[PDB]
Symmetry: D2
Subunit: 391 residues, 4 copies
């Protein structure tokens, strides 16, 4: 049998909440359920049609058994739905979509949900099993230990990024200009109503207090442009460039897509939003993660036979402003086509979610016939990339 064609029929997300902020009372799995239910409703299909589900999720500790199963059953999908939780660090939300697309291509399912989720607010601390050492011990923060420290270099991702800043001569002022640009694009996009088909609101309910309706991203309002060039370079004391403002932040969120074969969309009288054309993974030295998305994108372009000029919009995940700048520079692409409506530096980075969010954003924002290319770096030196065409 030949490979099946895969289409995106809907793509939906929660707003992104700030660390210990507006969505911090909700577990990752509950945000998961909200996004999945929303995506199914938007697709207009019976929920029974969804055959299987993959969700990205990096910091699974303390979330309870089978996080994807919790999200799926919490969304009211049938108990017959198999579930798998995916961890490619920062690339998790994209890799879930890629893996689901592989199952569909093989004809192993005809309809799936794929996406990502993360509640950094609820990630716990850990104590080693065993006897306590004389003199005491520090219980580690799993955001730091599992999420943000490179194993091999024993330093923060932010300190790894400094290496690329040095090698490619990307200065503090340029990184700060990029970050201000992201905040500006995010605000403009929200004010133009550009997220109306993408984001669904969340109602946070507390006993004995009034409901809070969270309807937009929280992070992009937390900025003061006049203070941006005043911040300390917290990942490197001497000759540093990366700051809290020009780096991504810690956040909570979930996103979900309904994926089908072309045959299934036809059978169900669904008009799909976009076609999944191709995808790829690349890896380089762990310290050099900022540059892996260049190679992953180049792989996809070469596979399909497109030139960079053929791409209408780029989503290069804003793990740090430095990452986007390194990518624009190496690929020599028009900066006006890159992260047009903001990104992780200003919208925030719930790590397991962002790779799904950026694909969902292209699905809504591209115009008919246009190609969009999303790419996302990950801890350990990896990246994933994906090319879609709007239908």
């Amino acid at each position: 049998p030949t490979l099946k064609e895969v289409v995106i029929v809907s793509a939906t997300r929660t707003p992104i909440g700030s660390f210990l902020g507006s969505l911090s009372l909700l577990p990752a799995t509950k945000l998961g359920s909200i996004a999945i239910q929303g995506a199914i409703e938007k697709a207009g299909i019976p929920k029974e049609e969804v055959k299987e589900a993959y969700m990205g999720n990096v910091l699974q500790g303390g979330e309870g058994q089978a996080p994807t199963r919790q999200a799926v059953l919490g969304a009211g999908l049938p108990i017959s739905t198999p579930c798998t939780t995916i961890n490619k660090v920062c690339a998790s939300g994209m890799k879930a979509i890629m893996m689901a697309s592989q199952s569909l291509m093989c004809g192993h399912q005809d309809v799936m949900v794929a996406g990502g989720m993360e509640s950094m607010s609820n990630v716990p601390y850990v104590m080693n099993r065993g006897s306590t050492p004389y003199g005491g011990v520090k219980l580690e923060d799993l955001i730091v230990k599992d999420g943000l420290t490179d194993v091999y270099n024993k330093i923060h991702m932010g300190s790894c990024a400094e290496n690329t800043a040095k090698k490619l001569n990307i200065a503090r002022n340029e990184q700060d200009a990029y970050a201000i640009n992201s905040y500006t694009r995010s605000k403009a996009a929200w004010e133009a109503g550009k997220f109306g088909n993408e984001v669904i609101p969340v109602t946070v309910t507390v006993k004995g207090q009034p409901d809070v309706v969270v309807k937009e991203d929280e992070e992009y309002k937390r900025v003061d442009f006049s203070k941006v060039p005043k911040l300390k370079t917290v990942f490197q004391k001497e000759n540093g460039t990366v700051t809290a403002a020009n780096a991504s932040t810690l956040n909570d969120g979930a996103a979900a897509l309904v994926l089908m074969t072309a045959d299934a969309a036809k059978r169900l009288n669904v008009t799909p939003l976009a076609r999944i054309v191709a995808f790829a993974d690349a890896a380089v030295e762990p310290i050099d993660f900022p540059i892996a998305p260049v190679y992953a994108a180049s792989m996809v372009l070469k596979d399909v036979g497109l030139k960079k000029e053929d791409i209408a919009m780029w989503e290069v995940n804003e793990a740090f402003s430095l990452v986007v700048l390194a990518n624009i520079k190496m690929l020599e692409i028009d900066p006006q086509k890159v992260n047009i409506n903001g990104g992780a530096v200003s919208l925030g980075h719930p790590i397991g979610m962002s790779g799904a969010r950026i694909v969902g954003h292209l699905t809504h924002a591209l115009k008919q016939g246009e190609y969009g290319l999303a790419s996302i770096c990950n801890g350990g030196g990896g990246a994933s990339a994906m090319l879609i065409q709007k239908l």
Copy 2:
């Protein structure tokens, strides 16, 4: 393009260590490295031929960033190798092989490594992020919270087993006889030298201490048959059936397979061990996970037009003695063909590893031309299954 045929070229595992036992000093990722290196060596190929790696791993908290990447880089594979860590609870090791097979089928890669790893000895305790409540702070055990507790019913997996024992009328004495039979068959297989090609020895090195070489599974010797019928029923104190002897145990270990397209196997002139014929996932009501493998197994047989009599060897993961008995009862298959060389009740159950182990064991044990079927239940009500044919 047409779908590619997938073959298993090698299948290797560490011995399985007991909880806080012979392998407890090694992190899961290090066991992973050991199995991966061993599988590549047994396949007779250069490490550079391995294109991408997926490993099952359920309890990832505190292991550090990107566990699969740590396993792969730790085995000396190229920095160019993309890695993804897979969590379908107890089914994780088999689902990793299934998902890698799908990538190979699509022609997206030609050689991959897939398997699973777990060090339950090193799984930590957690403390919640936030304000310390008045009156005390609880530190939860991630083995219990994420590993072994059903979310929806708020009971241990062993209490779900008790529920199936009720519904299917599977008694304590029946579960005890099965367990004694598992311990018996494990010892017989080790004595017969049946793991000589499957298992590779682990050298444990401690500064200022003599090297310890771990060459065989630890768990199967930890039993007293005279005491089996006297043990307390820990999941249900009154009229119970499940005990520590007749349930699987907590353990440490890793397993890894080298998988290739038929075309790659020919190009590299390797001798494949088995072909992957079919695989499937099923899911049922969470409390009924013991019976999910019955549906998964039925799906694979129907998919390829084989009847249950056509299967020479069954591996139904021994999560509990109850599970195997339930499967035999529903499928009406010959017990003499099931878990013939022991299983998880007597060999142990490093949860993310077991689904890979049982597929590897069929690859070694089957005679040329024979079909083997492996199935494995998972927390949340799921199961995975795979059918292979020995070459």
Copy 3:
């Protein structure tokens, strides 16, 4: 019968009492101690170098660092030659400190001492046992609950022990609630009347990048709603309860310190003493029966000096629970209008190591020349301390 030095109080000063996790919660108990000690020496009008030795009550010492009293004393700018001892008689600690200091002075072993109490319940930690973590997890215990508030022998809270006395003496919820509202009413009236002008010193809380906060009065007494008082649920006993959050004492932060000296030393230093310490005693009963131990301790002191209850102008019976004060009133048969007249621990709060010192300090200021004041304080384990002073 021994011939002893006469012991006088020259000053008695305290911080305001802060609410749990409230206005003074950023300050360690030892820092509150330094503030009270410095304040009392200033009020005494003596050189810091004249203080020979220091004793401080402090019940929950875990995580405060080595030698809490030493930290408070050196932190107050007293000489490195000053010996220090930290005292623990649970709730009675602040009073027992004064008693033991008085005993050294009587023996002529020192001529001038500082004695008091300190507690920061906001900063009391949780504990984890030494050893290996059990499979399945563990609860780390709260030291306020484990060391401060739980009876060892009955394995229940002090509040539950108090329910026992409520039963035996027929002291009902209504009477307890009425006593509590009275305490809150009296605390407010005293604060408004400026009755704490000489006793309390303000504390300035400083946080980098934020404005200063001057805490100049007790925080707790304003945290009440009289309308809700009779509607509160009984936390220590669901079945036939009487004790509630409102009519029991609360968790709090504060410190108190008194400058004590021999009558001779006061003359040498040309300072006018405020009061004379006449007598003091400890008593104990069954652990569960701690509410009634103060009756026996007070009687011992009266019998020792040969006075009668009517001779006492002012009583301070520590308000650990409203129940406690009512039990004492009933058994002693004293005039409730002479008891805790300017409020107490039910409305002002109860930093456990400090309250015993606070109540003696209050008598010192409030008594009129020539009058006798009796202070008594129950403690965890079935104990009580009591003290008689006479205004000078």
Copy 4:
């Protein structure tokens, strides 16, 4: 004018064996060891339990012991519920300060009979987590032995690190310290084998269900040494030019001591033979880093107060917190080393910190001959010391 005080005598002094850290007595909480010593002392004194009027116990690391540690020890020994109790903390000096404060009450005539002593279970001291919000990046669990017991607040370093400062100042080298340490072990073994603690120490039965009873009858720590290894050990408290080692410093331990104290009049009334009279005592303090020299001043204060000369003292007990401390005291006071710590001390017997001040006073009581004077001194964290002079009856 000086007050006219009652005379105070020691009628008994009893202790548990001292257990090693996580060693033979580690299953027993401090308060239980307290109960055993308190019952011991009463039984030895030959008086009814109801005669004891009030109790003071030294105890430095009280976290997690439960409410009112001294009350627990007392009620656990079967004393009347009518017995008032107070727990004392002068760090390392606690066990001696308890006896002094009880002596002051008796002198005043406020009680006629009391029990005073000290207790510590370092094996059972817990770890702590702070109340509040968990800070991003991790949460510390501190060891209370280190945080409350052994760390100087002001200098932010270990007691042993402060000790190095006096080693420097008084030129006391590694070899002299090691010689002292070996001397302590030698004395301890000699005394134990001679049966010198026959009336001082009482045995402890450890019961574990299923296990055979363990009877701990002698001090555990003194056998834990190898003299050939002593000179080879690393100086763990200072990188450069260190002198303090695990071998020549005191160890972490468990134990309790209790003394029955009464007025001369009560001993007559009760027809019991007093062991010693408590003559004088004092507290001294210096710069916190200089705690090893504090006992020098406290001892001098006592001798000056009673009008005695150093030469008049038959037996000295200078607490062996560190070998360094004893040598610094031998140096500054210029006393006869053969008269100091005759039957061993904390370097070889161990240092359950709230107990040790009581143990050493209890030791003089048993060891002195009729009419002899003994001086006991003990340094404490923060730069203090207590000292006591007694005379055998």
